[PDB]
């Protein structure tokens, strides 16, 4: 159904839905690993389905539609602990490339497209363990798409060769993010 921000399990999948309380967002958990999100002049939000904990060799499949109107992105999103890292494998985005201002650390070919790799640091920002300073790792697909298969191992191995290590895996989901924009998406994970 439609639900307020929170986390839990639905039809076998882990889900996490968060928003800054601005409103204008509607997140709905559907059958299996499906979820829909409709947003209109929203605040900041992130929602998706996946696993808790994720793994370093998972092959993630997603399919559906993604129609952003503004700042937003579709990605495999998750965290690792010890070290604390937030990572993204961006498959599509709207008006803003989220890696802008980031330090390019390489490139990796995987699942039909080249990806550019970047690293950035977040200072005193919210995280799964409280306020902290941690790094964000990004893999941004050059050929955008709204369905496909993601071999996470290829990204995690490429990041490691570049000195970008990961700790113990926390959740790992396919999510839709929005930052003061509008759009709609319906994605099925598996």
Swiss-Prot record:
Predominant subcellular localization, coarse grouping: secreted
Record domain GH11: where: 1-189
BP term (GO), one: xylan catabolic process
Pathway: Glycan degradation; xylan degradation
InterPro entries named in the record: ConA-like_dom_sf (IPR013320), GH11/12 (IPR013319), GH11_AS_1 (IPR018208), GH11_AS_2 (IPR033119), GH11_dom (IPR033123), Glyco_hydro_11 (IPR001137)
Active-site feature positions: 86, 177
Superkingdom of origin organism: Eukaryota
Binding site for substrate: 73, 77, 88, 122, 126, 136, 171
Catalytic activity from the UniProt record: Endohydrolysis of (1->4)-beta-D-xylosidic linkages in xylans
EC number(s) on file: 3.2.1.8
Family from the record: Belongs to the glycosyl hydrolase 11 (cellulase G) family.
Role: Glycoside hydrolase involved in the hydrolysis of xylan, a major plant cell wall hemicellulose made up of 1,4-beta-linked D-xylopyranose residues. Catalyzes the endohydrolysis of the main-chain 1,4-beta-glycosidic bonds connecting the xylose subunits yielding various xylooligosaccharides and xylose. The catalysis proceeds by a double-displacement reaction mechanism with a putative covalent glycosyl-enzyme intermediate, with retention of the anomeric configuration. Produces xylobiose and xylose as the main degradation products.
Protein name according to UniProt: Endo-1,4-beta-xylanase 2
